[PDB]
Amino acid sequence: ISEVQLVESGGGLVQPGGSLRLSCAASGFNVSYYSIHWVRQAPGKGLEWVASISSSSGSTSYADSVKGRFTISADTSKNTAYLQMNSLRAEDTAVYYCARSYWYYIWSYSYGNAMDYWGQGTLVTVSS
Amino acid sequence: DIQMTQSPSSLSASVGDRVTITCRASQSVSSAVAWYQQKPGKAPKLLIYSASSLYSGVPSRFSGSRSGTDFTLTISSLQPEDFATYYCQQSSSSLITFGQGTKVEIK
Amino acid sequence: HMEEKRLSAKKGLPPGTLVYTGKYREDFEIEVMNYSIEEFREFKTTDVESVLPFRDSSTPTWINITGIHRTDVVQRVGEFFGIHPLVLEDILNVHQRPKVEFFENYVFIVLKMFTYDKNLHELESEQVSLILTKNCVLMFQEKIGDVFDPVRERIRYNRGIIRKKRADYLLYSLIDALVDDYFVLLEKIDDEIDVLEEEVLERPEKETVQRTHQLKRNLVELRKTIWPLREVLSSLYRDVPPLIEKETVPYFRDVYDHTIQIADTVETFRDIVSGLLDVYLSSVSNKTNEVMKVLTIIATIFMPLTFIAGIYGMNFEYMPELRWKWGYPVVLAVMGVIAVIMVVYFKKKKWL
Amino acid sequence: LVYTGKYREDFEIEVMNYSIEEFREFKTTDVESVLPFRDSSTPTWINITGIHRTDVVQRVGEFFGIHPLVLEDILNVHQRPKVEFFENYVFIVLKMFTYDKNLHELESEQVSLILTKNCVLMFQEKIGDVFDPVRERIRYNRGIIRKKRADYLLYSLIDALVDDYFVLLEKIDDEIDVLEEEVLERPEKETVQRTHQLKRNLVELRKTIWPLREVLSSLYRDVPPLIEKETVPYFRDVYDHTIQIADTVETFRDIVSGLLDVYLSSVSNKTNEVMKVLTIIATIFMPLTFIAGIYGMNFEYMPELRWKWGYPVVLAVMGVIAVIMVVYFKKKKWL
Amino acid sequence: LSAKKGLPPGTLVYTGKYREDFEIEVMNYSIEEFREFKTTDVESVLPFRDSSTPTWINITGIHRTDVVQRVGEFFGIHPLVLEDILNVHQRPKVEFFENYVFIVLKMFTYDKNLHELESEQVSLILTKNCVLMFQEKIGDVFDPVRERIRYNRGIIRKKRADYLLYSLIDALVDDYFVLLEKIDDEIDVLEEEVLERPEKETVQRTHQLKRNLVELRKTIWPLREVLSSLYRDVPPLIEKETVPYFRDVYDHTIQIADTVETFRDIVSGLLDVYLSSVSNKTNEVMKVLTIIATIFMPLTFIAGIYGMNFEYMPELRWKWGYPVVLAVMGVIAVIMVVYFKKKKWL
Amino acid sequence: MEEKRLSAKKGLPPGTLVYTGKYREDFEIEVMNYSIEEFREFKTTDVESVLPFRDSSTPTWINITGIHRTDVVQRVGEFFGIHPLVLEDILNVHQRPKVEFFENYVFIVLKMFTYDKNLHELESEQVSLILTKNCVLMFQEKIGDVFDPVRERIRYNRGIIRKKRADYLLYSLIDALVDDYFVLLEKIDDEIDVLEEEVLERPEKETVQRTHQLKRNLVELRKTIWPLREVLSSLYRDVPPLIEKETVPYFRDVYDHTIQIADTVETFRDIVSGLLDVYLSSVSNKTNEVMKVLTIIATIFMPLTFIAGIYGMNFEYMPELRWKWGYPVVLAVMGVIAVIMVVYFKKKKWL
Amino acid sequence: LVYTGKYREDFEIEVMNYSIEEFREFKTTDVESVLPFRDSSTPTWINITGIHRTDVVQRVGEFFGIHPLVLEDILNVHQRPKVEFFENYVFIVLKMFTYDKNLHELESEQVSLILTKNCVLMFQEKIGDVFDPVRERIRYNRGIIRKKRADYLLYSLIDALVDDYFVLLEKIDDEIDVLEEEVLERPEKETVQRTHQLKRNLVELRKTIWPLREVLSSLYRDVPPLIEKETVPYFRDVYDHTIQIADTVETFRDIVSGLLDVYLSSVSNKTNEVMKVLTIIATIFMPLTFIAGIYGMNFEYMPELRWKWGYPVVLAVMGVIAVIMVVYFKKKKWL
Ligand SMILES: [Mg+2]
């Protein structure tokens, strides 16, 4: 029923040092059976992976640039992912994408995840 | 962290040519490298995973090869719809990092 | 070995995640055949939930889920059907040999299909997992293309006696179809071995030896995958669980006899491969014999001639170089003499 | 429908009716007259030679009530021997092989039998089969074949065929002995190809024989529907024969492989033998020639002089170095 | 040679190579009674089927088909197994009949000096309380059974004919044991020969041995099978009390098979080892062929440089001239030889 | 003649007790009568002091180590009602491993192997178990066992050995024997690796002798392994009255262990089969190195000596009268040809 | 007491005494300062860097009441990984590894862990190890190690060792991929030596990793009360990780073996090529040298005057026979 679709929301202008929560709604799949990544892209720069959540266990992963500041979570009841951003700096203005990843197998000791479907991406501006 | 240095950065080629983009991992990653493409203003689209396997639905012209810590994406014959930025990603560790990108433009 | 069954933790992975250990991710589909004595209904779909209410069905049913790269559908089916998480891992794990396990409510059988492409001389293996429950047979595959078409035809057109029996006969039919596919694969290996052996005698190049070595590896893998199949059938007809009826055991015994035949054929193949391997070495050694024979012919004829030429070409200022008929031509005669005899001697050994 | 065989030269019909009193023979080149037509009183034996004229096959299938499927299965040549049972008759398919000392390859023909009450209806492909002695038993009234029923006739035909298999095995054994002697004493390049061809013949025999053993094991021990219980042991005979034949073939296979290795053992040795020659002569003449080059010099001032017969001195030192080289090769056992 | 040609199934022609001697040894025993005699007359020993005590009739040298035919007719023995018993080239087997059981087995003899294996066919017909054993010539292996029944040893005297058949089969299996012992000794000798001192003829001998093995297999595997037919499905003719005993012999048979199989594998290795050896040896030869060449083929070339007929030769006295080049020639040899001394080629 | 003869007890009747082994030194009897709350160890020598144990109501582990004395075996068999054929099979060392289900007892014969790393020899000693009523009889040839963990488990309440009947004791014995097979397979794998390395690096005659010895040992070991699967399958699939229904899954586990052992043995056999061909290939590679050296020197110095001899005949019409620095230019030609031929070999990568 | 290894450059002692309230760390080069810590009820982690100093390890051995047999085991560097269970202390022997992608060598440094009540003793051989993450976790209180007993410390150390094994596996995977690419296409003499070295390294890694898996299995499955139940699952998880390693190594071995196989396939073809070259070169020069010598004697009656300008004609015939030989080598696929 329905195709896979990731929809980002909550982005917008915010004062430096503030906080806002980005919401990623997933339709077409259960968030519990996959991993949800947040990837940041600054205006006119390359991609930058910022967060990752595994809803089946609550295991989280954060980039060194945002460790201790960003908080990623997911709720299966609403089938949604959330990224709470506080102590927000002016460097964090960027477009955020919410992507779904699946694990694949290379050797018995090594695994890797590839991001199948990405969302539209919401622009967050930190200035003024 | 693992640094993926991706070269070139401003590759330019004509339709029907053969394009090779290389990217090198700072340390050892066990073939867990993916290749994405991104057109301006749109979300990235996955092309290659496991550095050799071809994702479902993408054209067969894309190919991926690995030699040690050097990962090469090759377009055998360019198309008018194949001019976009290309990104490596290493997923060996839980901290996954992207390359700096390689824009492909008409010549 | 034996211990409390549990999920296996893996490094660099969330504690509860199940990973598909395969390469095929092209497509996914679910085909359901619910048949009885009177009427049957079949349908192919993509939504998983549409086939969930078939768990509690009085009539036997067959749910073929092609494509297990979608771990979500596999997990949902296993969770609703009451399948153990370790069994789900075994379904998703592909780098394992065929096996059989017996649980309270289901029996779980891992088997390997096989395809052979003469071009590229490749032997590809695809894992199929069967779960037999009280009134349903689940079959997890990897990609489009199975060897269960005869069983599908029998269900559709009411041939055989498969319609009059329960799911145990369906499981037997699937296993028998897989064994027949194994027999067809062995016939293809017959053809490949014959074609390779008719060439290895007269075209002894390195690519032929590479083909022979990869064929030997293919037969090694075939033995390693067919012996556990024999054990699976043996445990299936000698340790029947309550799920499998007392009847239909002789059918499993017939399948066991078929896999005995297959194992014997593989055993003969394991020696035929070495028979082919020896021939290339024999032929190359024969060619080496020929080339070195002509080399030693030349050496034997010419080294003494050069030696005696050097002997009569060294200056001492007192040398009997003036003899009957001026002396010199006799030397050449001697040359020819100490030449022709050598050739005659080689005619004793039939060289050149 | 159609067949696959290659022979279309000759066609024939041979009926041989017999009983205790007297026997009848027609041998016509057409359907013409078929007296029994399920007479159920006289044992009949009808050979038809030829498969090009399929019309007779369809006619006899239509009359005696042979199912169309087995009629279709009849007109095949690339099929293994087989057997089927029916409430009215039984169906049987075997094959003859022919061997010669010309090019070492076996000519194969497929021959079918059908047993109905007092009727042995059979299809051949070529005249001059191995069933000639059996005809003798009919003609000269020898043995107990001219006693009762028609199943004993089928047993006699199968016994004649397994006797043909035995004589073919004897010919193959003689060929393997000849190749064994050749490999042991006269290795040749074509010898390995001949051994491979012989191995191909043996693997063809292995392919064919085992279905025959299955056919015989199905005729016995299965409680055949319509076969006299007095004649059941006779089948066992040929069954045992088939088993023996199979075993022989298996052994032959193994022994052939042995040749395919032992020949190699000579070839790798042959190289080594040639080794010594090339290693000996050089070791005797490469230094000697060098010594000549030492005395074929052009140096102005040398010890070169009549050093008490220096020319035979050089010849004698060459002789002594040659003899020490040859005695070193004697003690090394190279030559 | 196994070809009966175009003969009826009721033929009683004998196919063998032993017609020198022919006797009948009769041993009739009970719990307290013993009798034994040799005879050359059929009717002297003919009326024994209607007896209440076990008897053993060894009719050796089956080349006069009249005695075999008369014995078969008197006992009601089917002429089919008359043909089978008179056919030497028959694999071991068993047939069950309502009134008797028929067994065909083989006795093997080994000649070490010529390295050959001789086969003889023996048959045992057990009927009620009588055992008719048909042989081919003088001499057998059943002698320990004879001393057992003559000196009142074991429990053979106080048993039925089934135990006598079991004892005869056990003696035959024991003969197979000793023959495999001889073959094992031969294999040990051959492996020592091919591993320590390999020559050209050795391989031929190896082939001969291998042949014997497969031929032995041709007889060994049916034997196992026939004993199986005496254990997993026993007729009323064989007493239940003696059923376990046959099982024991069955074990022996399967053991024999295993041993034979093992032997085959060893022989299969042997030839490969020979290849190894010869390959090693040729390597050594190559080294020598290089050494001399590397020593003497360069040096003579130097002579060819200074042996030309050109006129402008710095050859009169160039620091004594002549011997100097000899020196450097020898010098070169030094390097060459020490080079080889550093590569372990001597 | 070696101590592996099979034609022993040739002229002997069935049921005669003859020992056909090589060990005749040690003899002892060890009894471990264990119950739910006490255990008694009664290691003694006289047979008469252990016979009354057959009527006990608790599991017993009579263990007669050293069976060269036929008198003790005969007395125990007579007291326990053991068939004479079973006793003669017990004393026959070369008996194939097997299991027999008699009416009052179960008779098993297995083999345990000892393997010395210092000297490549694999010795086999059989063990005969007789599970009779509530008692287990063990027969063996010499001191030195593998059931020491079973002894420790009985002495100190580590597992559930004392909470069950004698069938579980038979289970523990079989499982310990299978574990011994596993560890000896590991040792053989170690030698497989060392011989593979020796074949790849140092091809000699000692190497081929060691390979042949390993092949012989492995084929004997496989011959012993194969009956073990049948023994275990008969133990659990065909349930006898003596073996209780509760013990069957344990025997199934041992059957799985035997299947794994057989698979590993087959893999080892395949490796050993390939090893000799690997040796031949390695020796061929070394001789090819020698081939290449000889061919290179011949290539460099045959044309050179030919064109050195081309000038030097007695032709007085040759332009040898100082054509244009003839000797230096011909030496330069020698050097040029040598250099270009060396470059050609470098192109072929031989040099 | 003898130290079998080869690392004896430096020696030092490290102490981590941590609890919930606080931790104290000190690096000392004297033996005495570490003796009293057996009495401390808080978890304690001693680290003896050098075992070549037999005096300090011996003093620790008889002060902690551990049998001299385990001392000999500690000094036995060439020892398999193993585990020993005793009444008051558990003994473990493991092997670290170091891989550098320049020399392709795999050197193992044995490490011994002795766990006693509320303390862990480490015995190493060289400066530098793989337990740095455990040190950081203890220092900065990142994990839950500070709230557990010494059994969790042993678990953390074993887990760090397994992680180092994973890193080594990554390096070996890179090496295997590079070597496979270089062997399948463009082989050379260096590649086969690299393959042999890689096979030796994989054999050693397998030969070490299986005893490690046995150690972990016997450690969690049934253990004395030395380690609390709370840490029982954690060890279990580590065992699973080891399984991964083991399986990977097995797979890796197979791949490497296959490579060697193909290189052993074409040795005889190389022999044939080499002596094709040698026979061609020796064929066209030995008779030429022979006839040069023939015209190189010193006979007076030699027909050496003029006769069509003297020398050149023989050169001609040389070329003649030469091209003849060339023709004889143009065919037969020699050239
Ligand atoms: Mg001269």
Coordinates of C-alpha atoms in Angstrom, one line a residue, chain E residues 27-284:
Chain E
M27 CA 31.1 -87.0 6.8
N28 CA 27.9 -88.0 8.7
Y29 CA 27.8 -87.0 12.3
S30 CA 25.5 -86.8 15.3
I31 CA 25.8 -85.9 18.9
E32 CA 27.4 -89.2 19.7
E33 CA 28.0 -90.8 16.3
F34 CA 30.7 -90.1 13.7
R35 CA 31.3 -91.6 10.2
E36 CA 33.5 -90.6 7.3
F37 CA 34.5 -92.1 4.0
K38 CA 35.9 -91.3 0.5
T39 CA 34.2 -92.6 -2.6
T40 CA 34.2 -92.4 -6.4
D41 CA 30.7 -93.9 -6.9
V42 CA 27.5 -91.8 -7.0
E43 CA 25.1 -94.5 -5.7
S44 CA 27.3 -95.3 -2.7
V45 CA 26.6 -91.9 -1.2
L46 CA 23.4 -91.1 -3.1
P47 CA 20.6 -92.2 -0.6
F48 CA 21.2 -89.6 2.1
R49 CA 18.6 -87.0 1.7
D50 CA 16.1 -89.0 3.9
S51 CA 18.3 -88.9 7.1
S52 CA 17.7 -87.7 10.6
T53 CA 21.2 -86.4 11.3
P54 CA 23.4 -83.8 9.6
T55 CA 25.7 -84.9 6.8
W56 CA 28.3 -83.1 4.7
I57 CA 29.0 -84.4 1.2
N58 CA 32.0 -82.7 -0.6
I59 CA 31.8 -83.7 -4.3
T60 CA 35.1 -82.3 -5.5
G61 CA 36.2 -81.9 -9.1
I62 CA 32.9 -81.1 -10.8
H63 CA 33.9 -82.0 -14.4
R64 CA 32.0 -85.3 -14.7
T65 CA 28.5 -83.8 -15.2
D66 CA 26.8 -87.1 -14.6
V67 CA 27.4 -87.1 -10.9
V68 CA 26.2 -83.5 -10.6
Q69 CA 23.1 -84.2 -12.7
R70 CA 22.2 -87.4 -10.7
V71 CA 22.7 -85.6 -7.4
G72 CA 20.5 -82.7 -8.5
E73 CA 17.8 -85.0 -9.8
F74 CA 17.8 -87.2 -6.7
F75 CA 17.5 -84.2 -4.3
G76 CA 14.9 -82.5 -6.5
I77 CA 17.5 -79.7 -7.3
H78 CA 16.3 -77.5 -10.1
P79 CA 18.4 -77.8 -13.3
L80 CA 18.8 -74.0 -13.4
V81 CA 21.1 -74.1 -10.4
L82 CA 22.8 -77.1 -12.0
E83 CA 23.7 -74.8 -14.8
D84 CA 24.8 -72.2 -12.3
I85 CA 26.9 -74.6 -10.2
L86 CA 28.6 -76.0 -13.4
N87 CA 29.3 -72.4 -14.5
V88 CA 32.5 -71.4 -12.8
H89 CA 32.4 -67.8 -14.1
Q90 CA 29.5 -66.9 -11.8
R91 CA 29.5 -64.2 -9.1
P92 CA 28.7 -65.2 -5.5
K93 CA 25.0 -65.3 -4.7
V94 CA 22.2 -67.0 -2.8
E95 CA 18.9 -68.4 -3.9
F96 CA 16.0 -69.4 -1.6
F97 CA 13.7 -72.3 -2.3
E98 CA 11.0 -73.9 -0.4
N99 CA 13.0 -77.1 0.3
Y100 CA 16.6 -76.0 0.0
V101 CA 19.0 -73.0 -0.1
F102 CA 21.7 -72.6 -2.8
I103 CA 24.9 -70.5 -2.3
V104 CA 27.7 -69.8 -4.7
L105 CA 31.0 -68.5 -3.2
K106 CA 34.7 -68.2 -4.3
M107 CA 38.0 -69.4 -2.9
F108 CA 41.1 -67.4 -3.7
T109 CA 44.8 -68.4 -3.9
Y110 CA 47.8 -66.0 -4.2
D111 CA 51.1 -66.7 -5.9
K112 CA 53.7 -64.2 -4.6
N113 CA 56.7 -65.0 -6.8
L114 CA 54.7 -64.5 -10.1
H115 CA 52.1 -62.1 -8.4
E116 CA 48.9 -63.8 -9.6
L117 CA 45.5 -64.5 -8.1
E118 CA 43.8 -67.8 -8.9
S119 CA 40.0 -68.2 -8.3
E120 CA 38.0 -71.3 -7.7
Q121 CA 34.2 -71.5 -7.5
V122 CA 32.6 -73.4 -4.6
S123 CA 28.9 -74.1 -4.1
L124 CA 26.8 -75.1 -1.0
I125 CA 23.3 -76.6 -1.2
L126 CA 21.7 -76.9 2.2
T127 CA 18.6 -79.2 2.2
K128 CA 16.8 -80.3 5.4
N129 CA 19.8 -81.8 7.2
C130 CA 22.3 -82.2 4.4
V131 CA 25.0 -80.0 3.0
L132 CA 26.2 -80.7 -0.5
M133 CA 29.5 -78.8 -1.2
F134 CA 30.7 -78.8 -4.8
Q135 CA 34.3 -77.8 -5.5
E136 CA 36.6 -77.7 -8.6
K137 CA 39.8 -79.6 -7.6
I138 CA 41.8 -81.0 -4.8
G139 CA 42.7 -78.9 -1.8
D140 CA 40.5 -76.4 0.1
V141 CA 40.3 -74.2 3.2
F142 CA 37.5 -76.2 5.0
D143 CA 40.1 -78.4 6.7
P144 CA 39.8 -76.7 10.2
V145 CA 36.1 -77.6 10.0
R146 CA 37.2 -81.2 9.4
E147 CA 39.5 -81.2 12.4
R148 CA 36.7 -79.6 14.4
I149 CA 34.2 -82.4 13.5
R150 CA 36.8 -85.2 13.8
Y151 CA 38.2 -84.3 17.2
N152 CA 34.9 -83.2 18.8
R153 CA 35.8 -79.6 19.2
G154 CA 33.5 -76.6 19.6
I155 CA 29.7 -77.2 19.4
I156 CA 29.6 -78.2 15.8
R157 CA 29.1 -81.9 16.6
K158 CA 26.0 -81.2 18.7
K159 CA 24.3 -78.9 16.2
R160 CA 22.3 -79.0 13.0
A161 CA 23.4 -78.6 9.3
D162 CA 22.8 -74.8 9.5
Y163 CA 25.8 -74.5 11.9
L164 CA 27.8 -76.6 9.4
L165 CA 27.0 -74.2 6.6
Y166 CA 27.9 -71.3 8.9
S167 CA 31.2 -72.9 9.8
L168 CA 32.1 -73.5 6.1
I169 CA 31.3 -69.8 5.2
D170 CA 33.3 -68.7 8.2
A171 CA 36.3 -70.8 7.0
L172 CA 36.0 -69.2 3.6
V173 CA 36.0 -65.7 5.1
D174 CA 39.0 -66.7 7.2
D175 CA 40.8 -67.6 3.9
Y176 CA 39.9 -64.2 2.6
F177 CA 41.4 -62.7 5.8
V178 CA 44.7 -64.5 5.1
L179 CA 44.7 -63.5 1.5
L180 CA 44.2 -59.8 2.4
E181 CA 47.1 -60.2 4.8
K182 CA 49.3 -61.4 2.0
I183 CA 48.1 -58.5 -0.2
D184 CA 48.9 -56.1 2.7
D185 CA 52.4 -57.4 2.9
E186 CA 52.8 -57.0 -0.9
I187 CA 51.5 -53.4 -0.7
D188 CA 54.0 -52.6 2.1
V189 CA 56.9 -54.0 0.0
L190 CA 55.8 -52.1 -3.1
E191 CA 55.4 -48.8 -1.2
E192 CA 58.9 -49.2 0.3
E193 CA 60.3 -50.0 -3.2
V194 CA 58.6 -47.0 -4.9
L195 CA 59.5 -44.6 -2.1
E196 CA 63.1 -45.5 -1.5
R197 CA 64.5 -46.9 -4.8
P198 CA 62.3 -46.1 -7.8
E199 CA 63.2 -47.6 -11.2
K200 CA 61.5 -47.9 -14.5
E201 CA 59.9 -51.4 -14.1
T202 CA 58.5 -50.6 -10.6
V203 CA 55.5 -48.7 -12.1
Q204 CA 54.6 -51.8 -14.2
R205 CA 54.5 -53.9 -11.0
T206 CA 52.3 -51.2 -9.4
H207 CA 49.8 -51.6 -12.2
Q208 CA 49.7 -55.3 -11.7
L209 CA 48.9 -54.9 -8.0
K210 CA 46.2 -52.4 -8.8
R211 CA 44.6 -54.9 -11.2
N212 CA 44.5 -57.6 -8.6
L213 CA 42.8 -55.2 -6.1
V214 CA 39.9 -54.3 -8.5
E215 CA 39.5 -58.0 -9.4
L216 CA 39.4 -58.8 -5.7
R217 CA 36.7 -56.1 -5.4
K218 CA 34.7 -57.8 -8.1
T219 CA 34.4 -60.8 -5.8
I220 CA 34.5 -59.1 -2.4
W221 CA 31.4 -56.9 -2.7
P222 CA 29.0 -59.7 -3.8
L223 CA 30.2 -61.8 -0.9
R224 CA 29.2 -59.1 1.6
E225 CA 25.8 -58.9 -0.1
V226 CA 25.2 -62.7 0.0
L227 CA 25.9 -62.8 3.8
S228 CA 23.5 -59.9 4.2
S229 CA 20.8 -62.1 2.5
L230 CA 21.4 -64.7 5.2
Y231 CA 20.9 -62.2 8.1
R232 CA 18.3 -59.5 7.4
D233 CA 15.8 -62.0 6.0
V234 CA 16.2 -65.6 7.1
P235 CA 14.2 -68.6 5.8
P236 CA 12.8 -71.4 8.0
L237 CA 15.5 -73.7 6.6
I238 CA 18.2 -71.8 8.8
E239 CA 17.5 -72.3 12.5
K240 CA 16.8 -69.2 14.5
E241 CA 19.4 -70.2 17.1
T242 CA 22.2 -69.9 14.5
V243 CA 20.9 -66.6 13.1
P244 CA 23.3 -64.5 15.3
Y245 CA 26.2 -66.6 14.2
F246 CA 25.7 -65.7 10.6
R247 CA 25.5 -62.0 11.7
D248 CA 29.1 -62.3 13.0
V249 CA 30.3 -63.6 9.7
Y250 CA 28.4 -60.7 8.1
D251 CA 30.5 -58.3 10.2
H252 CA 33.7 -60.0 8.9
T253 CA 32.5 -59.5 5.3
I254 CA 31.9 -55.8 5.7
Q255 CA 35.3 -55.5 7.5
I256 CA 36.9 -57.2 4.5
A257 CA 35.3 -54.7 2.1
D258 CA 36.7 -51.8 4.2
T259 CA 40.2 -53.2 4.2
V260 CA 40.0 -53.8 0.4
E261 CA 38.8 -50.2 -0.1
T262 CA 41.7 -48.9 2.1
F263 CA 44.2 -50.9 0.0
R264 CA 42.8 -49.4 -3.2
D265 CA 43.3 -45.9 -1.9
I266 CA 46.9 -46.7 -0.9
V267 CA 47.6 -48.1 -4.3
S268 CA 46.0 -45.0 -5.9
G269 CA 48.5 -42.9 -4.0
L270 CA 51.5 -45.0 -5.0
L271 CA 51.8 -44.1 -8.6
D272 CA 51.5 -40.3 -7.8
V273 CA 54.4 -40.7 -5.4
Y274 CA 56.5 -42.3 -8.2
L275 CA 55.7 -39.3 -10.4
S276 CA 57.0 -37.1 -7.6
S277 CA 60.2 -39.0 -7.4
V278 CA 61.0 -38.9 -11.1
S279 CA 60.1 -35.2 -11.2
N280 CA 62.6 -34.5 -8.4
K281 CA 65.2 -36.5 -10.2
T282 CA 64.8 -34.6 -13.5
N283 CA 65.2 -31.4 -11.6
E284 CA 68.6 -32.5 -10.4

